[model samples]
Structure formats: structure tokens, C-alpha cells
Target: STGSATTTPIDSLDDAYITPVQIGTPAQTLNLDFDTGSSDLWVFSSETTASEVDGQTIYTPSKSTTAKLLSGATWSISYGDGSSSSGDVYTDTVSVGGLTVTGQAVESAKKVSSSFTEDSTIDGLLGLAFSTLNTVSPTQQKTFFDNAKASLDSPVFTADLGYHAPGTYNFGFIDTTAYTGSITYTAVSTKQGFWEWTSTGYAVGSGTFKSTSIDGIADTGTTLLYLPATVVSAYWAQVSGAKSSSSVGGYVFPCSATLPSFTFGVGSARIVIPGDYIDFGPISTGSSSCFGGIQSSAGIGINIFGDVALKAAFVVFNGATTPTLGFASK
Candidate 1:
């Protein structure tokens, strides 16, 4: 079974979904994944064969009178999970909610692999995590927020992950009530399109590393919080006691005991991850243990703190201004 909460069911296309806030005249609905790691928007197309488009949301530009294709341009993306997709570029009048932006850039795939074709419910992904990983270019540009930022009241967008309850992903204006107090902001680092941060240290259970040097990028597209092998082993060893199991992949300890909390130090901000949040889905091993949030990526070039860490706190992506990343409640 999947860890965390089960996603809420998709009651209707209209509920818990956001359209292209820029292209739609009134607003055309688009299902978006509020990913914190990358900044890009892509959707399937009617040009794709029925078999290739199965189980995925297909965007039919012909359906929209204002849609236009960007001739001779192709788009392709491949994720670490082995999922990949490639398509041609298109310009359309996209809409999301009640907002509308014009000349929006979109991707219309002529061929889609099983990875994308299998997910019938997901229309496309809206990367709102950080501005560092935007796939949009000056020549072929169409970002969900880039176009609609001017029209929004706060010039900000919020993602509500629980509108359908557990597993459902929701996008659009953030509900202010979901958070408490003011948001703590950090200036965006002058790096590539990846959200990078310096980890003051890390803590597992009662043990705290004041000067533990950890540097990595925060990604919403990734599913787990990937830490250095040395760090992952050290942290799990302290909390697992004799019951904790160490395998070739990562740390997997029995879920029966109260696992110590893992905290990450970001400047002065101390982000505490509760035990429940640390628990991931069961591993393929027969052991009755659940996986730890931390994974081992020895050869992996960059460290990524994915959804496991992001869901624990409120994340804000300030793109219009100095391009900062802020985290806090409400």
C-alpha cells in the first residue's frame, strides 16, 4: 500500500482541478500537479493515437477555437523514474478557474509512452515548486503562472493537496486558511532552474547534527527524500536500535516502534519531520518494516528532497520578484 494518505477520488473533472489560467477566454480547466521540484506545464494531445493516449488526459487544441500550434518544434522530457514523453509545441488560449491568459505555450504530444499513457486521470503537471527548473523558453514559452501572475490578486498561487482528501492533488490559489501565521521567505539562489538550499545539519531522533554539511535541491517531482548514504545510515542506525534493518537500497525499519523525528536545518529554520511522515510504503523484502524517507543515491549527482519533505511544510515559490523560495505555515 502507498504511504501517507490515499489521494481523494476525482468526483468530476471540474472539482479539484485548475485550467490554463492564461489561454482560456473565460477559463479552460486543466489538471495540474503542484510539484515543488520543477517549473513546467505539459499536456497530452488529440494527435496522439488512442492506444498511446489511453489512461491519460488528452488536450484537443481543435476543441479550443483560439488554440494554435508552434510549428516545427518538438518537446521531450524524461524522469528518473524511467517515465518519458515527447510532443510538438502549440500555442493556445489557456484558462484555469475563472482566469484567462492568451498566447500560452503548450505541448501536444504525437507519441506518448506507457508511463504517461497509463495515468488517465492526470491531465498534465503544473510545476510551481521553484523557478529554477522552468522548461519554458523565450522562443517557445507557456507557463501556467508566468502568464497568469499579473491577473492574480496576490500575484501568488497556492496548491491544496487534500481537496479530495488523502491522495488527490489540487492546484490553484492557495487557501489562506490552510496555513497559520506569516510565511518565512528565503532569497532564491542564483543557480540553474533548480531550487537549492544549504542544510545547516540533520537530526535523527534525539541526535542532532549542528554542523552536518548537507546540500541539495528541493524537488516536488521526486517522490522520496534522497540523502547521502553516509547520512542515511547514520540517522537510521541511531533510531532503529537493534530492530532497524539496513539493506542494499535504503534504511527499512519496523514500523512498530516510535521512530525518532528527523529534522533538517535550513539557515535558522529548523524543519521537523514527525515519525509518521518518515514512514514510507513497505519494501519488497518480506520483513515487516517500512522504508525510511531517506534513500541512498551514491552515483546520483544531486540530492533531492521530494514530496515526503515538501508535504510537511508550506512551500511558496516567488517567481515574479527576486525569485525566492519561502516555507512556513499559511
Candidate 2:
């Protein structure tokens, strides 16, 4: 059996693509962020502290007769952006698109950070990373994908992240119609429970793509592109008014600045990200200053190819014996 789901960019926050997921016996559907960066299917639920939830639609396990508590089992997860969630566990039926998984481990959020509380449109996160990243302690839990991959025709999925537009997520099958051109494949190292790979080179503005190896990750949950300090310096130098602003949290420049284009290569594929796309909205509302989408991943061991970078190409996440990544121009 095979299944696939169509997701769309949130009109409110184009930073993420959301898909509908159902949990429990009598399915209660919720819009969740299909995050490829993490591996925990958590939801704002009845167990969550009232003060922690802003206006999110909470998942009520009591409503589902099939819900069964996993005694003493707990989960906690934090993102690179500082958003976090912690909760207990429940086993229930979970479904996405046309596929369903029985006895799925569903984490019920008991606490949520302001980052999640402020985003009411997002009910929770459906992590697509490897099951090894699952936060459940004492006994690690398998994600919906991991639990369902066995029955799938092929253990694979595709991410088509659109820029301020609709996108699709395919499971167990790749949709040839959704992408243009042949997908250039690359070996992936999932040692860190991430789709991590190294770029062959990078270029700033009209510069040639040089062979400068940069190891990074493809994270759909992240809103901005993060790179090494050295790489970021090169991109920032291209902008006349761009400056590293500790007060603004990242490199900032006049929103009107005509930033130059940035390009990176994977194997033979040369992916270019327009300068305007790097000007991640504004530092603040009504402010003339804009924060750069590409920042330094200083403390973080590897850089991240967030939505700012991933949206530029169609990505295939192959979950085979040895994970592989495929990239193609949209």
C-alpha cells in the first residue's frame, strides 16, 4: 500500500507547510507542521498547561475510545529556534493522507514554549526525521513514518516546499509529475537523525562556484538558512548596508537594499537562491531594517538548509538501507 499527502503554506506564516493528520479511534484531525528536522509527533493536548496554550486546537485523547496511555512514558523536544514541547505518551491510530497506522505513538504536549503558543494555526509537529531522534525517554518511540514504512511499497518520501505557495508531501512513492528535470542524487548521512550532506561549493553574487565543502542539513522546520560564519561573511559582504546586528539577532540591512544572489552546488546541480529571498521579511513590523535569512550556525556543529534554501529545489528523502537525497530544480 502507498500514500501521499498534499500540504500548503500557511497564509499567515509562509515559513511553514502544514498538513492534516488524524489521531485516535474516532479521528480528530489537526493541522500539523510536517517537520523534516525533528522526530516526534507531538500535539497540544488536554494535558498541556492551560497557560501554555494560546489558541491552538488541542487534541483530546478522552474523545478517542482507542487512546491508551503509555504509563511512565514521556517525551520532550526542542528545536534550533528555541521552541520546545514536553509531554506524556499515548498509543492510538494515526492517519495521514490515505494511509493509516495502528498503535501509533502519539506524544501529548503538557508544556509548550511561547514560540508554539504564539502560532495558533499550528496544532503540533509531525516530525519526519529518523525514529532515532524521537524524544521519548527510557524507551524511544518510533515515528509515524517509521511505524508505517514497513508496509509501504518503498521506504521513501518527497518534500516539495513552495515559496508562499502550496506544496505536497509524498509518502512511499515519488510523484514524477510534481517535479521538473531529473533529480540529482547524493548520499546522506543520518548519523545525527538528520538528512545531512555536504555541498560541493558555494558562490556569492556573480562569483564562480568554487569547491568549498560545507556540511549542513536540510531542515524544513527552520525558517531561515544557516551557514558557517565564514560563508555568512561572504554573503553579508555583498550587501552594501548589511551588518551583523547583535540587537537584531542576525545580519540586518535596509529592507530596500538590493541584495545579490547566492548559489550552492550539490554534485552537478547548481542551486541559486535569489537575494530578495534572503531578506527574511523585516526585523520588526513597520521597520525599514530586514534580517538576513542566512545566518551563522556558530554553536551548532553543522549548518542548516532551512525553508529559505530548501524551497528553491524539489527534495527527495530516500529512506532505504542507506538514506539518500535527491535534488532537482523546480
Candidate 3:
């Protein structure tokens, strides 16, 4: 069996993508961030402190007859942005799109960070990463994808993220109509519990491919694309008036400057990012300076192919016994 869901960007910058998820017996629908970087299906819930709750929709397990507490089970997680959350655990019927998972572990938020409290666009997160990355204590819980994979037509899921618009996330099957040309398949290293892979090389605009091996993770949770400092510098150098700014915390350029396109190799296939895509947006409200979608990974320890990169191509996350990744232009 297969299922699909529509995911919408949260803000003008395409900060994150959110999808509606049904939880509990009567199906309390909440908009959740489907994060491929982490593995914890936690959500804002009735147990969360009132002071921490903003306008987010909360899941009230008490109102669902199918909900049952997982005694002593608890979870806590911290993100790269320094935001964190911790909560008790409960098992209930959870469904995404049309795929149903009975007894899915739904982490109920008891405490949340200020960032989460302030942002009401996302009620919680649905982790698509490997279950090994789950934060539950005593006994780790499997992610929704892991629990539902066996019954699916194929143990795989695909992400079709969009820029400033809505996209589709498909499960169990690859939709040929969703992408163009033959998909370039690559080996995935899941030891780190991420959809990690090594890119063959990169090229700026119409330049020749560098043939450099670059390692990075396909992370939907992150907002921007981060690469090696040398690569990022080379790309921005071609843009006149572009420079790294301390105050802006990234490369910025004149809002009217023409941006060169970026291309990365997946095997022999070239995935080209449009020049306009690199022009993230204005630095501030109506500012003449604009921020770049690509940034340096120097201090981050790892390169991230976030939404800036993902939206340019169709991606498949294969969860078979021997997993792999597939990329194609859409």
C-alpha cells in the first residue's frame, strides 16, 4: 500500500514544511513538521504548560479512547538551533495522508523551548530518520516510517519540497509523473541515522564540474544549504558585490545582482539549481541587500543539503534492507 501528503512551507523564506497529521481515536489533526533529520514523533499536547502554548493545535490523549500511556516512557531532544523539548510518551492510532499506524508512539510535550512556543505554524515534528535516532528512554520507539514500511508496496518514501509553495510527500511507491528523466541512484550511509551521501562534485553556473567528493546529509528540517567553505566561497565570488557579513551571519549581496546557478553531481547526473533560487530573499524588510541560500559549513561540522537544495530536485529515501537514495530533476 502507498500514501501521499501535501506539505506546505511555513513562511516566505520557506523556513520549514508542515503537513497535517491525524492522531488519537477521533483523529486530532495537527500541522506537523515532517523532519528527515531527526527521529522522534513528538507533538504539542494537552500536557504542555499553558504558558508555553501559543496558537498551536494540541493533541489531547484524554479525549481519545484509543490512547494509552507508555508507563515510564519519556523523551527529550535538542536541535541545532538550540531549541529543545521533553515530554511523556503515549501510544495511539496515528495516520498520515492515508497510511495508518496503530499503536504509534506519540510523544506528548510537557515542556518546550521559546522558539517552539513562539512559532505556531508547526504544532510538532514527525521524524522520518531511522528509529535508531529515537530519543525515547528505557525502550526506544520506532518511527512512523519504520513501523509502516513492512506493509508498504516498497520500503521507501519520497520528498518533493517546494519553494514558497506546497509540495508532495509520497510513501511506498515512486511516482514517475512527479519527476523527469531517469533517477540517479546512490548509496546511503545510515550509520549516523541520517540520509547521508557523498556528492561527486559541484560546478558554479556553466563552469566545468570540480570532481570533488563532498559529503552531506539530505535534511528537510534545515532551512538553508551549507557546503564546504571553499565551495561556498567560489560560488559567491562570481556574484559581484557579494561578501560574507558578520551581522547578517552569511553571504549577502546587492538585491539587484545576478546570481549564478549551482550544480551538484549525483553519479553522472547534474542537478542544477536556478540562479534565482540562490537569491534567498531580502536581508531585512525592504532592504537593498539579500541573503544567499547557500552558506559555509566550516563551523557546523557537517554539510547540509537542506530545503534550498532539496526543492530543486525529487528525492527518494529508500528504507529497504539495503537502503539507497535516488535523485531526479522535477
- Which candidate has the top score in TM-score? 3
Stronger candidate by TM-score (2 vs 3): 3
How do the residues 1-330 of candidate 2 rate in per-residue lDDT, one tens digit apiece? 677777887763466778989888788998899888999999999999999888888889999999999889998887877778999999999999888999988999999999889887899999988888999987899988888899888888888887777788878888888778888888889989998988888999898777888888888888888998998998899888899998878889888889888898889888888877686767778999988888999987779999888888888888898988888877
Candidate 2, residue 181: the lDDT equals: 83
Ranking by lDDT: 3, 2, 1
TM-score of each: 0.78, 0.96, 0.98
Clashes, model 1 = 32
- In candidate 2, what residue range of length 10 has the lowest lDDT sum? 8-17
Most accurate candidate by lDDT: 3
RMSD of each: 6.0, 1.4, 1.0
Between candidates 1 and 2, the TM-score winner: 2
Report lDDT per candidate: 0.59, 0.86, 0.93
lDDT of 2: 0.86
Q: What lDDT does candidate 2 reach at residue 17?
A: 77
Q: What is the lDDT of residue 302 in candidate 1?
A: 74
TM-score of 3: 0.98
